[PDB]
Amino acid sequence: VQTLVTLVAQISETQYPVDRYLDWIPSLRASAATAATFAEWVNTSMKTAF
Amino acid sequence: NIHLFKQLLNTETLSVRGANPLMFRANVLHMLLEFVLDNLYLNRHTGFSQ
């Protein structure tokens, strides 16, 4: 969950305070569905890793 | 578009290309009433995509 909130906050406007290192990489203003797909890809990565 | 204005009381009109001017108001009122009636609907929420 910490890994999830940290990453998703770097593609959306979330008030969870993170220092941001990848703003110079272009990206869109992620919506609910886009964040959902992104989290889906994140979740499977962790499960297959462990 | 003549056929719209001869729909109410032109039962005596012979020609198909003509209409009686004296029932213009009645035909217009009927047209407006049907215009209102045909639009009595509730808007539906379908779904979006970014």
Side-chain angles (χ1 to χ4, degrees), chain B residues 8-30:
Chain B
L8 212 53
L9 282 169
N10 294 250
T11 186
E12 182 65 26
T13 296
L14 198 58
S15 166
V16 72
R17 274 171 321 261
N20 188 315
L22 295 169
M23 291 66 88
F24 277 167
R25 190 184 298 169
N27 283 268
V28 164
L29 294 174
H30 177 79

Short mmCIF file of all heavy atoms in Angstrom, two decimals, chain B residues 8-30:
data_model
loop_
_atom_site.label_atom_id
_atom_site.label_comp_id
_atom_site.label_asym_id
_atom_site.label_seq_id
_atom_site.Cartn_x
_atom_site.Cartn_y
_atom_site.Cartn_z
N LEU B 8 -54.39 19.95 -39.91
CA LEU B 8 -55.41 20.04 -38.87
C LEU B 8 -56.82 20.18 -39.42
O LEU B 8 -57.69 19.36 -39.11
CB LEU B 8 -55.10 21.21 -37.93
CG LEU B 8 -55.55 20.96 -36.50
CD1 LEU B 8 -55.00 19.64 -36.03
CD2 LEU B 8 -55.09 22.07 -35.60
N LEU B 9 -57.08 21.20 -40.23
CA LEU B 9 -58.44 21.48 -40.65
C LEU B 9 -58.59 21.62 -42.16
O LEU B 9 -59.65 22.03 -42.63
CB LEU B 9 -58.95 22.76 -39.98
CG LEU B 9 -59.39 22.59 -38.53
CD1 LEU B 9 -59.62 23.94 -37.89
CD2 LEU B 9 -60.65 21.76 -38.48
N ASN B 10 -57.56 21.28 -42.93
CA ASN B 10 -57.66 21.39 -44.38
C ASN B 10 -58.31 20.14 -44.96
O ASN B 10 -57.78 19.55 -45.91
CB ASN B 10 -56.29 21.61 -44.99
CG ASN B 10 -55.68 22.93 -44.60
OD1 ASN B 10 -55.56 23.84 -45.42
ND2 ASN B 10 -55.30 23.05 -43.34
N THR B 11 -59.45 19.74 -44.41
CA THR B 11 -60.18 18.62 -44.98
C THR B 11 -60.93 19.00 -46.24
O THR B 11 -61.37 18.12 -46.98
CB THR B 11 -61.17 18.05 -43.95
OG1 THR B 11 -61.77 16.87 -44.48
CG2 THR B 11 -62.25 19.07 -43.65
N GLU B 12 -61.08 20.30 -46.50
CA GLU B 12 -61.72 20.77 -47.71
C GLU B 12 -60.72 21.10 -48.81
O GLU B 12 -61.10 21.14 -49.98
CB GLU B 12 -62.55 22.02 -47.39
CG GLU B 12 -63.32 22.60 -48.56
CD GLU B 12 -64.38 21.65 -49.08
OE1 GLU B 12 -64.87 20.82 -48.29
OE2 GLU B 12 -64.74 21.75 -50.27
N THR B 13 -59.45 21.29 -48.46
CA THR B 13 -58.43 21.60 -49.45
C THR B 13 -58.31 20.47 -50.46
O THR B 13 -58.24 19.30 -50.10
CB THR B 13 -57.09 21.82 -48.76
OG1 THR B 13 -57.18 22.97 -47.90
CG2 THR B 13 -56.00 22.05 -49.78
N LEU B 14 -58.30 20.84 -51.74
CA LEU B 14 -58.24 19.84 -52.81
C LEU B 14 -56.80 19.54 -53.20
O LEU B 14 -56.37 18.38 -53.17
CB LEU B 14 -59.03 20.33 -54.02
CG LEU B 14 -59.42 19.24 -55.01
CD1 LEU B 14 -60.24 18.17 -54.31
CD2 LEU B 14 -60.19 19.82 -56.18
N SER B 15 -56.04 20.57 -53.56
CA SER B 15 -54.69 20.37 -54.05
C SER B 15 -53.79 19.80 -52.95
O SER B 15 -54.01 20.01 -51.76
CB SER B 15 -54.10 21.68 -54.56
OG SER B 15 -52.70 21.56 -54.73
N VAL B 16 -52.77 19.07 -53.38
CA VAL B 16 -51.79 18.54 -52.45
C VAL B 16 -50.68 19.55 -52.17
O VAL B 16 -49.98 19.42 -51.15
CB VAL B 16 -51.19 17.22 -52.97
CG1 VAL B 16 -50.27 17.49 -54.15
CG2 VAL B 16 -50.47 16.47 -51.87
N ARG B 17 -50.51 20.54 -53.03
CA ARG B 17 -49.46 21.54 -52.85
C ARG B 17 -49.93 22.78 -52.10
O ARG B 17 -49.12 23.67 -51.85
CB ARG B 17 -48.90 21.97 -54.20
CG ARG B 17 -47.80 21.08 -54.72
CD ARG B 17 -47.46 21.44 -56.16
NE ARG B 17 -48.66 21.75 -56.93
CZ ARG B 17 -49.26 20.91 -57.75
NH1 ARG B 17 -48.78 19.68 -57.91
NH2 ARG B 17 -50.35 21.28 -58.41
N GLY B 18 -51.21 22.86 -51.75
CA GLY B 18 -51.77 24.04 -51.13
C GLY B 18 -52.20 23.81 -49.69
O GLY B 18 -52.26 22.69 -49.19
N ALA B 19 -52.51 24.92 -49.03
CA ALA B 19 -53.01 24.89 -47.66
C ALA B 19 -53.82 26.15 -47.42
O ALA B 19 -53.63 27.17 -48.08
CB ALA B 19 -51.87 24.77 -46.65
N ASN B 20 -54.72 26.08 -46.45
CA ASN B 20 -55.59 27.20 -46.14
C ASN B 20 -54.91 28.11 -45.13
O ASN B 20 -54.60 27.65 -44.02
CB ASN B 20 -56.92 26.72 -45.60
CG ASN B 20 -57.92 27.84 -45.45
OD1 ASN B 20 -57.61 28.92 -44.95
ND2 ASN B 20 -59.15 27.59 -45.88
N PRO B 21 -54.69 29.38 -45.44
CA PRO B 21 -53.99 30.25 -44.49
C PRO B 21 -54.75 30.47 -43.19
O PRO B 21 -54.12 30.74 -42.16
CB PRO B 21 -53.85 31.56 -45.27
CG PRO B 21 -54.98 31.53 -46.22
CD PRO B 21 -55.12 30.11 -46.64
N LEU B 22 -56.07 30.35 -43.20
CA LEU B 22 -56.84 30.72 -42.02
C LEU B 22 -56.68 29.73 -40.87
O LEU B 22 -57.02 30.07 -39.73
CB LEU B 22 -58.31 30.86 -42.37
CG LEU B 22 -58.57 32.01 -43.34
CD1 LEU B 22 -59.99 31.95 -43.86
CD2 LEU B 22 -58.31 33.34 -42.66
N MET B 23 -56.17 28.53 -41.12
CA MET B 23 -55.87 27.60 -40.04
C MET B 23 -54.38 27.52 -39.73
O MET B 23 -53.93 26.55 -39.09
CB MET B 23 -56.42 26.20 -40.34
CG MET B 23 -57.93 26.14 -40.31
SD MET B 23 -58.78 27.08 -41.58
CE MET B 23 -58.83 25.87 -42.88
N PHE B 24 -53.61 28.52 -40.16
CA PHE B 24 -52.19 28.53 -39.85
C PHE B 24 -51.95 28.55 -38.35
O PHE B 24 -51.07 27.85 -37.84
CB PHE B 24 -51.52 29.72 -40.52
CG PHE B 24 -51.16 29.49 -41.95
CD1 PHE B 24 -50.79 30.54 -42.76
CD2 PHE B 24 -51.19 28.22 -42.48
CE1 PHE B 24 -50.46 30.33 -44.08
CE2 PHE B 24 -50.87 28.01 -43.80
CZ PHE B 24 -50.50 29.06 -44.60
N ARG B 25 -52.71 29.36 -37.63
CA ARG B 25 -52.50 29.46 -36.19
C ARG B 25 -52.80 28.14 -35.50
O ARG B 25 -52.05 27.70 -34.62
CB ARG B 25 -53.35 30.58 -35.60
CG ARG B 25 -52.99 30.89 -34.16
CD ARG B 25 -53.91 31.94 -33.58
NE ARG B 25 -53.82 33.20 -34.29
CZ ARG B 25 -54.66 34.21 -34.12
NH1 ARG B 25 -55.66 34.10 -33.26
NH2 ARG B 25 -54.50 35.33 -34.81
N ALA B 26 -53.90 27.48 -35.88
CA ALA B 26 -54.22 26.20 -35.27
C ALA B 26 -53.16 25.16 -35.57
O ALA B 26 -52.74 24.40 -34.69
CB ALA B 26 -55.59 25.73 -35.74
N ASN B 27 -52.70 25.12 -36.82
CA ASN B 27 -51.66 24.15 -37.17
C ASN B 27 -50.38 24.42 -36.40
O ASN B 27 -49.72 23.49 -35.93
CB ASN B 27 -51.41 24.19 -38.67
CG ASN B 27 -52.48 23.47 -39.45
OD1 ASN B 27 -52.35 22.28 -39.75
ND2 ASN B 27 -53.55 24.17 -39.77
N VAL B 28 -50.03 25.69 -36.24
CA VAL B 28 -48.82 26.04 -35.50
C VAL B 28 -48.95 25.63 -34.04
O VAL B 28 -48.00 25.11 -33.44
CB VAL B 28 -48.53 27.54 -35.64
CG1 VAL B 28 -47.54 27.99 -34.59
CG2 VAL B 28 -47.98 27.82 -37.02
N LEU B 29 -50.11 25.88 -33.44
CA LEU B 29 -50.30 25.47 -32.05
C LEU B 29 -50.19 23.96 -31.89
O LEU B 29 -49.56 23.48 -30.95
CB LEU B 29 -51.65 25.95 -31.53
CG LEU B 29 -51.79 27.47 -31.43
CD1 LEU B 29 -53.20 27.83 -31.05
CD2 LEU B 29 -50.81 28.00 -30.42
N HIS B 30 -50.78 23.21 -32.82
CA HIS B 30 -50.66 21.76 -32.74
C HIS B 30 -49.20 21.33 -32.89
O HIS B 30 -48.74 20.43 -32.18
CB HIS B 30 -51.51 21.10 -33.82
CG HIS B 30 -51.39 19.62 -33.86
ND1 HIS B 30 -52.06 18.80 -32.97
CD2 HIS B 30 -50.70 18.80 -34.68
CE1 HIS B 30 -51.77 17.54 -33.25
NE2 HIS B 30 -50.95 17.51 -34.28
#
